[PDB]
Design an enzyme around this catalytic site. Sequence first.
Site, short mmCIF file in Angstrom:
data_model
loop_
_atom_site.label_atom_id
_atom_site.label_comp_id
_atom_site.label_asym_id
_atom_site.label_seq_id
_atom_site.Cartn_x
_atom_site.Cartn_y
_atom_site.Cartn_z
N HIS A 67 0.86 -1.22 0.00
CA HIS A 67 0.00 0.00 0.00
C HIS A 67 0.88 1.25 0.00
O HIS A 67 0.78 2.08 0.93
CB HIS A 67 -1.00 -0.04 1.16
CG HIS A 67 -2.11 -1.01 0.93
ND1 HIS A 67 -2.17 -2.22 1.59
CD2 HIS A 67 -3.18 -0.97 0.11
CE1 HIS A 67 -3.25 -2.88 1.20
NE2 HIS A 67 -3.88 -2.14 0.29
N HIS A 71 1.87 1.65 -5.72
CA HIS A 71 0.45 1.20 -5.80
C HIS A 71 -0.45 2.37 -6.25
O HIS A 71 -1.26 2.18 -7.18
CB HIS A 71 0.01 0.57 -4.47
CG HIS A 71 -1.45 0.27 -4.40
ND1 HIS A 71 -2.04 -0.71 -5.18
CD2 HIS A 71 -2.44 0.81 -3.65
CE1 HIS A 71 -3.33 -0.77 -4.89
NE2 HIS A 71 -3.60 0.14 -3.95
N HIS A 105 -5.89 7.45 -3.09
CA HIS A 105 -6.94 6.55 -2.53
C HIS A 105 -6.41 5.73 -1.34
O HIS A 105 -7.26 5.21 -0.60
CB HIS A 105 -7.55 5.65 -3.61
CG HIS A 105 -6.75 4.42 -3.84
ND1 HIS A 105 -5.65 4.42 -4.65
CD2 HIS A 105 -6.84 3.17 -3.31
CE1 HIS A 105 -5.11 3.22 -4.66
NE2 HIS A 105 -5.82 2.43 -3.85
N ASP A 106 -5.09 5.59 -1.16
CA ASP A 106 -4.52 4.84 0.00
C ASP A 106 -3.58 5.73 0.84
O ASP A 106 -2.72 5.16 1.53
CB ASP A 106 -3.79 3.59 -0.48
CG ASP A 106 -4.68 2.36 -0.63
OD1 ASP A 106 -5.66 2.22 0.14
OD2 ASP A 106 -4.37 1.55 -1.48
N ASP A 216 -8.10 -0.81 -8.39
CA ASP A 216 -7.46 -1.17 -7.10
C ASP A 216 -6.90 -2.60 -7.17
O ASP A 216 -5.80 -2.81 -6.64
CB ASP A 216 -8.44 -1.01 -5.94
CG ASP A 216 -7.78 -0.81 -4.59
OD1 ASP A 216 -6.58 -0.47 -4.57
OD2 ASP A 216 -8.49 -0.97 -3.57
N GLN A 268 -5.54 -17.85 -3.83
CA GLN A 268 -5.61 -17.01 -5.06
C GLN A 268 -6.78 -17.50 -5.93
O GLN A 268 -7.62 -16.68 -6.32
CB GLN A 268 -4.27 -17.03 -5.78
CG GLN A 268 -3.19 -16.25 -5.04
CD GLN A 268 -3.48 -14.77 -5.04
OE1 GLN A 268 -3.77 -14.17 -6.08
NE2 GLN A 268 -3.44 -14.17 -3.86
C1 LIG Z 1 -4.06 -10.26 -5.77
N1 LIG Z 1 -4.81 -9.29 -4.97
N2 LIG Z 1 -4.92 -8.02 -5.43
C2 LIG Z 1 -5.62 -7.37 -4.52
C3 LIG Z 1 -5.95 -8.20 -3.43
C4 LIG Z 1 -6.73 -7.87 -2.22
O1 LIG Z 1 -7.59 -8.65 -1.82
N3 LIG Z 1 -6.49 -6.71 -1.58
C5 LIG Z 1 -7.38 -6.18 -0.55
C6 LIG Z 1 -6.61 -5.95 0.72
O2 LIG Z 1 -5.51 -5.08 0.50
C7 LIG Z 1 -4.63 -5.66 -0.44
C8 LIG Z 1 -5.30 -5.87 -1.77
C9 LIG Z 1 -5.39 -9.45 -3.75
C10 LIG Z 1 -5.35 -10.74 -3.06
O3 LIG Z 1 -4.37 -11.48 -3.18
N4 LIG Z 1 -6.42 -11.05 -2.27
C11 LIG Z 1 -6.59 -12.24 -1.54
C12 LIG Z 1 -7.96 -12.45 -1.08
C13 LIG Z 1 -8.26 -13.55 -0.38
N5 LIG Z 1 -7.29 -14.49 -0.08
C14 LIG Z 1 -7.35 -15.67 0.63
C15 LIG Z 1 -6.08 -16.19 0.59
C16 LIG Z 1 -5.56 -17.39 1.26
C17 LIG Z 1 -6.42 -18.29 1.89
C18 LIG Z 1 -5.92 -19.38 2.59
C19 LIG Z 1 -4.56 -19.57 2.71
C20 LIG Z 1 -3.69 -18.67 2.12
C21 LIG Z 1 -4.19 -17.58 1.42
N6 LIG Z 1 -5.22 -15.34 -0.09
C22 LIG Z 1 -5.97 -14.32 -0.49
C23 LIG Z 1 -5.63 -13.17 -1.24
MG LIG Z 2 -7.30 0.97 0.23
ZN LIG Z 3 -5.47 0.47 -2.96
#
Ligand SMILES: Cn1ncc(C(=O)N2CCOCC2)c1C(=O)Nc1ccn2cc(-c3ccccc3)nc2c1
Ligand SMILES: [Mg+2]
Ligand SMILES: [Zn+2]
Length: 314
Positions: A67, A71, A105-106, A216, A268
Amino acid sequence: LMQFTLPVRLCKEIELFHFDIGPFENMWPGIFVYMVHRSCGTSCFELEKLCRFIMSVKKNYRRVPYHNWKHAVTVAHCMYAILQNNHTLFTDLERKGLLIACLCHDLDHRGFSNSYLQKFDHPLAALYSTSTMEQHHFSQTVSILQLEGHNIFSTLSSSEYEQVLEIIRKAIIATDLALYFGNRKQLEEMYQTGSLNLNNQSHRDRVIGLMMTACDLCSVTKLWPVTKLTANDIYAEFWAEGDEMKKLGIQPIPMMDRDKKDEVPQGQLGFYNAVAIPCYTTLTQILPPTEPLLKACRDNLSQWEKVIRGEETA
Ligand SMILES: Cn1ncc(C(=O)N2CCOCC2)c1C(=O)Nc1ccn2cc(-c3ccccc3)nc2c1
Ligand SMILES: [Mg+2]
Ligand SMILES: [Zn+2]
């Protein structure tokens, strides 16, 4: 006039949705001004005020893994690509407001979620009960705009200034992913009943909201090497938060537990199926020229599936 120019490769590739802004931090302000000049116009902002504004925004981003200032400019670039490929659909004030909204925005993000601030009992959680960090990002935007020599909207009437600050406020609040699920469902129902109306300001607000989510989350719309390396920075933050949850004596959610590292590819896959694909699907329905975001998202979904089958390593 002094016009902003980029080297040949950047000039060509910045028009692509999957552009990466590169590792040279000192080039990002120029990349942002270039995008403002082409998507808004060379007369939208006084160059001196805009440059002062940009450097003050940069100073109020923190040295966190994800963040961060990179970004902010990355999200602004995705908005630039959407605006340039849909140039007849947006107003003068929306063009002026939305690249600024994305840059800001962040602001002052510390790499922690709204949930962590609530559990910690951070003072921001008392001030802003919902969308805690997003209300903070907007408050930080207003603070910078009110600094001497930073009023980049100084040529607007009182009423026009109020409208653009309302566009910025709504756009920043929409980046609270908790709000996205409701917003996308409303837009899906509106599109499928054929009630969606871009002359309706409440509908425009929802479409801009979904555009902000799309910008985002745009790491999932890059070429695979960029997508994979960005995920490392996202998890660096998630796992630091998980550690802090454990210090409060609270079991973190699986994505925030660094001991669950081996489950990331399945995590993912879950995220692409539940959030990313639906997001870019609904955006392409409303704005067909955003198709390349959805195509790239589907391509990365296929990459994470290959990791899960053990044909790719991550
Ligand atoms: C690529 N990407 N781009 C933006 C975002 C995002 O959500 N943001 C909001 C929060 O602030 C960062 C961006 C992501 C992302 O990877 N999300 C996520 C969402 C849910 N998950 C569940 C798991 C996971 C579950 C079990 C074990 C290990 C991992 N891993 C994830 C990653
Ligand atoms: Mg944000
Ligand atoms: Zn953001």
